[PDB]
Amino acid sequence: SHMDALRYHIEWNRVAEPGTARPAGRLLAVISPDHAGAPWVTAVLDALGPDTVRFEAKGTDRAAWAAQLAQLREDEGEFHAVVSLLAAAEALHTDHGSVPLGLAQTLLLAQALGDAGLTAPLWCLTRGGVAAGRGDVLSSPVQGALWGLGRVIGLEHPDRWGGLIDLPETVDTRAAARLTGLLADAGGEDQLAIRGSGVLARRLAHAAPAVPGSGKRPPVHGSVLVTGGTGGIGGRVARRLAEQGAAHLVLTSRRGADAPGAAELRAELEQLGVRVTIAACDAADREALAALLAELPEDAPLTAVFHSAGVAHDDAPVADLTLGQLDALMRAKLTAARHLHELTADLDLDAFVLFSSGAAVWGSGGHPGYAAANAYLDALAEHRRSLGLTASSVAWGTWGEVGMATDPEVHDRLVRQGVLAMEPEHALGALDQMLENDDTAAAITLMDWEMFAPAFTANRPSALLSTVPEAVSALS
Numbered sequence: 001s002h003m004d005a006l007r008y009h010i011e012w013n014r015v016a017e018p019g020t021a022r023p024a025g026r027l028l029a030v031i032s033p034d035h036a037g038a039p040w041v042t043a044v045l046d047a048l049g050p051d052t053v054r055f056e057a058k059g060t061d062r063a064a065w066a067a068q069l070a071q072l073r074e075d076e077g078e079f080h081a082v083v084s085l086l087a088a089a090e091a092l093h094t095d096h097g098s099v100p101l102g103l104a105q106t107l108l109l110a111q112a113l114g115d116a117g118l119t120a121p122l123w124c125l126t127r128g129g130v131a132a133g134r135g136d137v138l139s140s141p142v143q144g145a146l147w148g149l150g151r152v153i154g155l156e157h158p159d160r161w162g163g164l165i166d167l168p169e170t171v172d173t174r175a176a177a178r179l180t181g182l183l184a185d186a187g188g189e190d191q192l193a194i195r196g197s198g199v200l201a202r203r204l205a206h207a208a209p210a211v212p213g214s215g216k217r218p219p220v221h222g223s224v225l226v227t228g229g230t231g232g233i234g235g236r237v238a239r240r241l242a243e244q245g246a247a248h249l250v251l252t253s254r255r256g257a258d259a260p261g262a263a264e265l266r267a268e269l270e271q272l273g274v275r276v277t278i279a280a281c282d283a284a285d286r287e288a289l290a291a292l293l294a295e296l297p298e299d300a301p302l303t304a305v306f307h308s309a310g311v312a313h314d315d316a317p318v319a320d321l322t323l324g325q326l327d328a329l330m331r332a333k334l335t336a337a338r339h340l341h342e343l344t345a346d347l348d349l350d351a352f353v354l355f356s357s358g359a360a361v362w363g364s365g366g367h368p369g370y371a372a373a374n375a376y377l378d379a380l381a382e383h384r385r386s387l388g389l390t391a392s393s394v395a396w397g398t399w400g401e402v403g404m405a406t407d408p409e410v411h412d413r414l415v416r417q418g419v420l421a422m423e424p425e426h427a428l429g430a431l432d433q434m435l436e437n438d439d440t441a442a443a444i445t446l447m448d449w450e451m452f453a454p455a456f457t458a459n460r461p462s463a464l465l466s467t468v469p470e471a472v473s474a475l476s
């Protein structure tokens with residue numbers, strides 16, 4: 001099936017044990033000084049040894065840090081690598097309420113490193129930022145957002161990017177030597193998870209072809225909330241849900257009933273026999289979401305959430321992105337999803353579906369903030385499953401016909417890299433296959449791998465695509 005052919009999933013596969021020798025040159029470890037006390041942080045510092053130079057990254061001050069870094073590099077000469085432990089700062093930034101401090105500080109570290117001319121590869125360390133290997137629990141969706149940013153740093157600054165490595169719960173000497181061995185030589189891998197049983201690396205693979213009924217998707221009924229539901233993809237989603245038996249669709253967006261084409265969408269849906277509520281509700285406004293849930297009919301309880309609210313504009317290259325630009329991109333993603341998760345964790349939903357992006361799955365140059373914000377969605381769906389709650393994340397490629405890519409500016413970039421426009425019917429038919437399987441995570445994308453692989457790997461290899469035979473063929 002053509003719909004099967006759109007579905008991919010991320011997998012984690014065992015890679016080689018690294019060597020036993022620590023790096024020969026000096027490491028620079030970067031610490032968030034208010035968030036330096038987590039057991040994993042202390043275990044990593046202890047692993048890097050006391051000849052490691054330590055840099056405390058205080059506040060969020062690019063220029064100040066560029067000066068401090070330039071001095072360290074003057075005094076020490078080249079470093080072997082930069083090891084960032086800033087991900088431990090999960091608290092939200094005081095001035096940008098949708099940005100985790102660690103995320104803002106990682107962006108400023110990547111910028112300031114470039115500003116000072118430190119060229120040693122940067123490695124971003126997380127703990128519980130990914131779900132790698134069977135039974136693995138993703139404990140920190142916040143740190144998971146950092147992997148969306150790091151993949152984009154690897155595309156924009158390939159020559160000074162090491163990679164990402166997730167630490168285990170307890171960093172024992174076996175975990176420590178795996179870490180220090182990877183910092184000595186990682187075999188070309190750059191998205192790694194250290195676990196009890198071995199070191200795992202991230203891979204993209206074609207998904208299992210569809211099986212009718214396997215995940216036992218309950219029939220669509222009751223009230224379903226589609227945030228961004230007046231939007232391109234969200235309106236098509238609502239039409240499908242209508243066709244599928246929803247009693248009541250609650251569509252939200254900032255503009256609500258004043259959104260473009262909202263009257264037409266309400267009319268098409270109602271012709272189908274559905275109750276329609278359209279509300280103007282910022283998805284990051286907790287009190288407004290609560291008010292909306294409190295209003296639902298007794299006879300039509302919430303049964304599902306489809307989170308399509310989001311913006312992609314006003315992003316920027318890693319070297320330029322501001323914290324205010326990052327905040328505005330994170331708002332509908334991190335803040336809204338966190339509220340949706342908190343207000344439905346007790347409702348026994350049949351589906352909690354979060355719409356992510358290929359920028360968060362593989363990465364796309366020029367879109368670091370969107371990549372981080374979408375990577376948090378993917379992370380939260382895995383975390384929710386760990387709590388015994390339903391969730392899925394669907395990272396879309398490019399939609400044709402409706403939505404954000406229907407601009408010869410935004411359309412023509414993606415398609416030229418081999419990320420082709422999907423027919424909405426095909427994209428939705430694939431999503432239903434994912435829902436019928438009850439899968440946690442998928443990318444649904446039409447790819448031209450002959451165009452995509454070579455373009456994506458022009459400046460550094462990708463181990464992520466080694467598990468796509470089309471990509472392996474294109475690079476042969």
Ligand SMILES: NC(=O)C1=CN([C@@H]2O[C@H](COP(=O)(O)OP(=O)(O)OC[C@H]3O[C@@H](n4cnc5c(N)ncnc54)[C@H](OP(=O)(O)O)[C@@H]3O)[C@@H](O)[C@H]2O)C=CC1
Nearest residue numbers: 228231232233253254255283308309310396398399403404
């Ligand atoms: N189109 C595509 O190819 C792809 C889309 N995606 C993702 O799919 C989802 C749908 O995108 P698409 O339909 O194409 O985009 P659209 O711009 O058509 O729809 C996005 C919308 O979400 C709403 N929205 C934006 N911010 C908020 C907010 N803070 N609170 C509530 N609603 C908000 C918008 O309305 P308003 O401005 O009135 O709030 C609009 O309804 C997005 O999350 C997007 O990131 C991912 C990959 C590809």
